[PDB]
Structure formats: structure tokens, C-alpha cells
Motif scaffolding. Structure first.
Motif, PDB file in Angstrom:
ATOM      1  N   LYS A  21      -9.006  71.476  66.292  1.00 53.13           N
ATOM      2  CA  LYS A  21      -8.057  70.237  65.858  1.00 53.13           C
ATOM      3  C   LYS A  21      -7.144  70.805  64.771  1.00 53.13           C
ATOM      4  O   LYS A  21      -7.867  71.282  63.726  1.00 53.13           O
ATOM      5  CB  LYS A  21      -8.847  69.074  65.294  1.00 53.13           C
TER       6      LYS A  21
ATOM      7  N   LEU B 168      -3.791  69.987  62.275  1.00 53.96           N
ATOM      8  CA  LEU B 168      -2.927  68.852  61.520  1.00 53.96           C
ATOM      9  C   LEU B 168      -1.812  69.723  60.697  1.00 53.96           C
ATOM     10  O   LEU B 168      -2.003  70.745  60.064  1.00 53.96           O
ATOM     11  CB  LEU B 168      -3.801  68.311  60.640  1.00 53.96           C
TER      12      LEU B 168
ATOM     13  N   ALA C  33     -11.684  72.636  62.396  1.00 53.17           N
ATOM     14  CA  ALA C  33     -10.519  71.829  62.155  1.00 53.17           C
ATOM     15  C   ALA C  33      -9.422  72.675  61.206  1.00 53.17           C
ATOM     16  O   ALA C  33     -10.103  73.399  60.347  1.00 53.17           O
ATOM     17  CB  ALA C  33     -10.855  70.716  61.215  1.00 53.17           C
ATOM     18  N   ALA C  34      -8.111  72.578  61.338  1.00 55.44           N
ATOM     19  CA  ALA C  34      -7.530  73.192  60.412  1.00 55.44           C
ATOM     20  C   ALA C  34      -6.271  72.446  60.020  1.00 55.44           C
ATOM     21  O   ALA C  34      -5.644  71.557  60.728  1.00 55.44           O
ATOM     22  CB  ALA C  34      -6.777  74.597  61.162  1.00 55.44           C
ATOM     23  N   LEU C  35      -5.615  72.594  58.751  1.00 52.17           N
ATOM     24  CA  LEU C  35      -4.767  71.937  58.070  1.00 52.17           C
ATOM     25  C   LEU C  35      -3.732  72.889  57.525  1.00 52.17           C
ATOM     26  O   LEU C  35      -3.977  73.686  57.032  1.00 52.17           O
ATOM     27  CB  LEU C  35      -5.463  70.902  56.882  1.00 52.17           C
TER      28      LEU C  35
ATOM     29  N   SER D  18      -6.068  75.441  55.174  1.00 48.44           N
ATOM     30  CA  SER D  18      -7.494  75.219  55.114  1.00 48.44           C
ATOM     31  C   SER D  18      -8.136  74.963  56.629  1.00 48.44           C
ATOM     32  O   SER D  18      -7.689  74.725  57.574  1.00 48.44           O
ATOM     33  CB  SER D  18      -7.709  73.691  54.422  1.00 48.44           C
TER      34      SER D  18
HETATM   35  C1  LIG Z   1      -8.459  67.035  54.119  1.00 41.45           C
HETATM   36  O1  LIG Z   1      -8.567  67.137  55.567  1.00 41.45           O
HETATM   37  C2  LIG Z   1      -8.765  68.360  56.147  1.00 41.45           C
HETATM   38  C3  LIG Z   1      -8.998  69.480  55.691  1.00 41.45           C
HETATM   39  C4  LIG Z   1      -9.002  70.633  56.463  1.00 41.45           C
HETATM   40  C5  LIG Z   1      -8.961  70.499  57.901  1.00 41.45           C
HETATM   41  C6  LIG Z   1      -8.744  69.271  58.547  1.00 41.45           C
HETATM   42  C7  LIG Z   1      -8.697  68.197  57.653  1.00 41.45           C
HETATM   43  C8  LIG Z   1      -8.588  66.647  58.208  1.00 41.45           C
HETATM   44  O2  LIG Z   1      -9.081  66.489  59.652  1.00 41.45           O
HETATM   45  N1  LIG Z   1     -10.278  65.994  59.534  1.00 41.45           N
HETATM   46  C9  LIG Z   1     -10.554  64.901  60.234  1.00 41.45           C
HETATM   47  C10 LIG Z   1      -9.470  64.156  60.832  1.00 41.45           C
HETATM   48  C11 LIG Z   1      -9.782  63.688  62.006  1.00 41.45           C
HETATM   49  C12 LIG Z   1      -8.601  62.970  62.834  1.00 41.45           C
HETATM   50  C13 LIG Z   1      -7.424  62.771  62.283  1.00 41.45           C
HETATM   51  C14 LIG Z   1      -6.278  62.286  63.031  1.00 41.45           C
HETATM   52  O3  LIG Z   1      -5.597  62.756  63.967  1.00 41.45           O
HETATM   53  O4  LIG Z   1      -5.977  61.024  62.940  1.00 41.45           O
HETATM   54  C15 LIG Z   1      -7.242  63.186  60.964  1.00 41.45           C
HETATM   55  C16 LIG Z   1      -8.231  64.093  60.293  1.00 41.45           C
END
Ligand SMILES: COc1ccccc1CO/N=C\c1ccc(C(=O)O)cc1
Ligand SMILES: COc1ccccc1CO/N=C/c1ccc(C(=O)O)cc1
Lengths: 116, 117
Positions: free
Chosen positions: B7, B9, B100-102, B109
Motif C-alpha cells: 500500500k 500513500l 505500507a509506504a508513505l 516512511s
Molecule cells: C502515518 O501513516 C503511515 C505511515 C507510514 C506508512 C503508511 C502510513 C499510513 O497507512 N496506514 C494505513 C492506511 C490505510 C488506508 C488508508 C486509506 O487509503 O484511506 C490510509 C492509511
């Protein structure tokens, strides 16, 4: 000092001390050649990795050996290491700081690129 | 598919990171990185179906996320070539893994959520 590495521990709220860091430069045959290495200090920092002369444009990888840091603390880790891969660019500022914030199942890294 | 999901973002736009290329590698007996699976994130920022529980054996895996190309398509010249995530999988039996990657232009992250099916 054109390249510095700073490592923080998000569990202990401290510098990440005695973390091995290895820097590689990508060679013309696409392999990673060792370039510089060391261990972070009591402040979580590693200076003196390279010189302006040797730190020419190219693709570099900074590996931070996070698994052995967490293992020493008795905390199960997810990652083998944290890898930071980037192209060094002469048109930009002259100092690169690679900062990393470590947790057992997560890390974040940022680059701070500045001109003294 | 559920054993391995990615995932991504975008922290600039507050959105999924869509159409991001992801390449998965597995360390071979000769210590080289052998291609394992690849794909692109969907409009939800998610990539499913990379592998199966049968194919996803114990090993050291590397998930490369091609962040540089993502940012360039938005007009941004980013710092990193990719976000890499390297981990040992399934060492104590099968698990499900979400990577998950941001993403930001000069930062990323990554977190892992690991569940026991
Ligand atoms: C601070 O969050 C971080 C930090 C590092 C990596 C990832 C995240 C967030 O992802 N986690 C969860 C998430 C799940 C779904 C959605 C959605 O699509 O609505 C958004 C967020
Ligand atoms: C949330 O912050 C993040 C997130 C990702 C990566 C790095 C950071 C922080 O970078 N730290 C910088 C820093 C420098 C000196 C001191 C000191 O004087 O002790 C403390 C902190």
C-alpha cells in the motif's frame, strides 16, 4: 563533510548508538561497490565518511544495519536493514544529511540537503 | 491475494499513490536477488495478487517501490531512487504481510503489518 548520517531510535527516544552503516556507489556494471562505512557515535551520527573530492555525482546506497541494532536490544525486528538509495547531484546544495528514525517494524528516512 | 500486499500513500496530495511500479525479489542460494513478482498500485494505492501462500516460501525478500518515476510524472525531482523494504518472511511459518509506504519528495516512511492467518 559532504555526507552525514543521523540515526534516531523511536522506541527509546534516543540517538541510535553503535549502528553499522555502509555506503556503496553504483559501478558501471550496475553492481554496488563499497565506498565508506562506520558506526554511529553516541550522538547517533556518523561523520567523515567521504571527502568533497571523492563524492562525485553518481548513485549511492546507504545501508543502515537496523536488524543487529534491534537484536542487541532484545526487540524482534522486521527489516534486515534500512536502505537509502539516491543520486548525488552537483547542481544542488553541497551537504547531504541522511536522517533515519527507527522502530522495530517501521523506519522513516529524510534527506536534508543544505549549503553552508 | 493476501500473503503479500503493498500500500502506497502520497503525503503531498493526501491521496493513494496510483500506478506506482513495485518489484519483489527473493534472495537465491547464490546470494543474488532473483525476480519474484511485480505489479503496479491500483487507484486505491494497493497492490494485491503478487504471490500465493504456496509460492511465498521462507526467504529474504526485497520490495522495491519505484518512487522516483512516480514523483517525476507529477513534475517533482525527488531525492530517492526508490523505497526498498528488505525482510525475512515466513521464518516461523506462514504470515500475511502488508508493506505500507508513505511518500514525500525528500522522505519516505515504511511500516509492516504482519498477521498470523
Ligand atoms: C502515518 O501513516 C503511515 C505511515 C507510514 C506508512 C503508511 C502510513 C499510513 O497507512 N496506514 C494505513 C492506511 C490505510 C488506508 C488508508 C486509506 O487509503 O484511506 C490510509 C492509511
Ligand atoms: C520525526 O523526526 C524524524 C523523522 C524521520 C527521520 C528523522 C527525524 C528527526 O531527525 N532528527 C534530527 C535531530 C538532530 C539532532 C538532535 C539532537 O540534538 O538531539 C535531534 C534530532
Amino acid at each position: 563533510c559532504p555526507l552525514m548520517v543521523k540515526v534516531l531510535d523511536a522506541v527509546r527516544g534516543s540517538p541510535a548508538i553503535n549502528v553499522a552503516v555502509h555506503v556503496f556507489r553504483k559501478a558501471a556494471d550496475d553492481t554496488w561497490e563499497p565506498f565508506a562505512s562506520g558506526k554511529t557515535s553516541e550522538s547517533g551520527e556518523l561523520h567523515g565518511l567521504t571527502t568533497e573530492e571523492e563524492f562525485v555525482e553518481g548513485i549511492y546506497k546507504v545501508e543502515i544495519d537496523t536488524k543487529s541494532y534491534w537484536k542487541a536490544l532484545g526487540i524482534s525486528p522486521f527489516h534486515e536493514h534500512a536502505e537509502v538509495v539516491f543520486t548525488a547531484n552537483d547542481s544542488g546544495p553541497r551537504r547531504y544529511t541522511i536522517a533515519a528514525l527507527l522502530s522495530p517494524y517501521s523506519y522513516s528516512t529524510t534527506a536534508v540537503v543544505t549549503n553552508p
